Design a protein around this motif. Structure first.
Motif, PDB file in Angstrom:
ATOM      1  N   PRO A 112     -28.415  67.237  24.185  1.00 41.47           N
ATOM      2  CA  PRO A 112     -27.946  66.084  23.387  1.00 41.47           C
ATOM      3  C   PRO A 112     -26.695  65.402  23.943  1.00 41.47           C
ATOM      4  O   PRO A 112     -25.768  66.078  24.391  1.00 41.47           O
ATOM      5  N   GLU A 113     -26.725  64.053  23.976  1.00 41.97           N
ATOM      6  CA  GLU A 113     -25.657  63.131  24.403  1.00 41.97           C
ATOM      7  C   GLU A 113     -24.407  63.398  23.560  1.00 41.97           C
ATOM      8  O   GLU A 113     -23.304  63.522  24.085  1.00 41.97           O
TER       9      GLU A 113
ATOM     10  N   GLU B  60     -23.233  61.425  20.545  1.00 43.29           N
ATOM     11  CA  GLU B  60     -22.579  60.229  20.046  1.00 43.29           C
ATOM     12  C   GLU B  60     -23.441  59.360  19.119  1.00 43.29           C
ATOM     13  O   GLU B  60     -23.496  58.131  19.254  1.00 43.29           O
ATOM     14  N   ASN B  61     -24.076  60.043  18.141  1.00 48.88           N
ATOM     15  CA  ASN B  61     -24.818  59.514  16.990  1.00 48.88           C
ATOM     16  C   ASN B  61     -26.201  58.943  17.177  1.00 48.88           C
ATOM     17  O   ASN B  61     -26.830  58.573  16.188  1.00 48.88           O
ATOM     18  N   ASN B  62     -26.692  58.870  18.412  1.00 51.01           N
ATOM     19  CA  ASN B  62     -28.015  58.312  18.706  1.00 51.01           C
ATOM     20  C   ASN B  62     -29.085  59.363  18.581  1.00 51.01           C
ATOM     21  O   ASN B  62     -28.799  60.523  18.866  1.00 51.01           O
ATOM     22  N   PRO B  63     -30.349  58.979  18.248  1.00 48.79           N
ATOM     23  CA  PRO B  63     -31.434  59.972  18.193  1.00 48.79           C
ATOM     24  C   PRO B  63     -31.648  60.673  19.532  1.00 48.79           C
ATOM     25  O   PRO B  63     -31.301  60.152  20.594  1.00 48.79           O
ATOM     26  N   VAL B  64     -32.146  61.894  19.451  1.00 45.19           N
ATOM     27  CA  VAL B  64     -32.377  62.699  20.641  1.00 45.19           C
ATOM     28  C   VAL B  64     -33.764  63.351  20.621  1.00 45.19           C
ATOM     29  O   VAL B  64     -34.280  63.692  19.558  1.00 45.19           O
TER      30      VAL B  64
END
Ligand code: LGW
Length: 301
Positions: free
Chosen positions: A111-112, A114-118
């Motif tokens: 996972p990145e 910073e709130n974006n879907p993964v």
């Protein structure tokens, strides 16, 4: 030495384009080649080069090292397609694997944050398909009398269609240099991927390759965490030699961990072969595995 053979390709048949990244001897590029895959006029290839400052000894070294790949013909082992030894820059043409090394691939899946879907971590089916491909490349190598000595996710490559293959031998890089440790002399070794016997005597066999294969499954399951994370390189040596093992990764199906544990048997003779690993998972591999694998080939016994 440096003797040109049937692998020799005319320089005008090669077109180098984008950089893939640096190798031991020089820059690796992506490109296209004519007449390297039968009579195909345009095949997307990877091109290994020697730095322009390199000496004659260094170029001949690069050609002879690379040349070991000429013996192999396996769908689960990255292919050598050609050699440009006449004139400079000295080139080695290879099968292109668009998605790079397996360790970078697995870490790019984390996972990145910073709130974006993964995308959810890889499914057990997706992991078994990687395991089976790696194990097949490894069973082919063993049948061809080779002990790999450095099997690890960083040394597995990922193709455009996600097929995993055993990468070109001895690729140095720089990115995963902390995966190596020298306790002795000409012994800068991959300690966290080594069997208790190889750490003791410095001898490697198909059995110690099987141990490192178990480490690769753990890397797949952990999205390429450092094996024995909480330990220093010195602590790893003692911990593994004394019967210590990697923990079951969180959310790792028992089925995949049981396979890891089988690979990690203290006695090398108690570890399954790569043929034995494939047999246990053959039912789970994509139907195409029965047509392209070494396992299902006439060459397998
Ligand atoms: O990631 C690796 C790599 C290659 C082989 C290996 F065994 N371990 C790592 N490397 C080596 C230099 C550039 C970089 C590398 N190589 C890529 N593809 C390759 C390399 C090869 C044969 C030429 C080597 N075929 N396809 C690739 C695709 C996307 C990013 N990279 N980075």
């Amino acid at each position: 030495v440096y003797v040109p053979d049937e692998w020799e390709v005319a320089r005008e048949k090669i077109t180098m384009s984008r950089e893939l990244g640096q190798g031991s001897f020089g820059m690796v590029y992506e490109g296209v080649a004519k007449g390297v895959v039968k009579d195909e006029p345009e095949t997307r290839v990877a091109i290994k080069t020697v730095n322009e400052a390199a000496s004659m000894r260094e170029r001949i070294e690069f050609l002879n090292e690379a040349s070991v790949m000429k013996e192999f013909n396996c769908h689960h082992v990255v292919r050598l397609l050609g050699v440009v030894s006449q004139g400079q820059p000295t080139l080695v043409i290879m099968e292109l694997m668009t998605r790079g090394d397996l360790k970078s691939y697995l870490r790019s899946l984390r996972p990145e944050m910073e709130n974006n879907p993964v995308l959810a971590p890889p499914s057990l089916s997706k992991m078994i398909q990687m395991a089976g491909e790696i194990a097949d490349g490894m069973a082919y190598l063993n049948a061809n009398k080779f002990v790999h000595r450095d099997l690890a996710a960083r040394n597995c490559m990922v193709a455009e269609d996600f097929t995993v293959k055993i990468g070109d031998f001895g690729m140095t890089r720089d990115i995963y240099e902390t995966d190596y440790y020298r306790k002795g002399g000409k012994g800068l070794l991959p300690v966290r991927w080594m069997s208790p016997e190889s750490l003791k005597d410095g001898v490697f066999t198909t059995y110690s390759d099987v141990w490192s294969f178990g480490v690769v499954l753990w890397e797949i399951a952990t999205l390429a965490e450092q094996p024995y994370q909480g330990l220093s390189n010195e602590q790893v040596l003692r911990f593994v030699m004394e019967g210590g093992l990697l923990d079951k990764p969180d959310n790792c199906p028992d089925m995949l961990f049981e396979l890891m544990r089988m690979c990690w048997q203290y006695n090398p003779k108690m570890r399954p072969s790569f043929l034995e690993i494939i047999s246990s998972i053959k039912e789970e591999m994509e139907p195409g595995f029965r047509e392209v694998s070494f396992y299902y080939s006439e060459e397998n016994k």
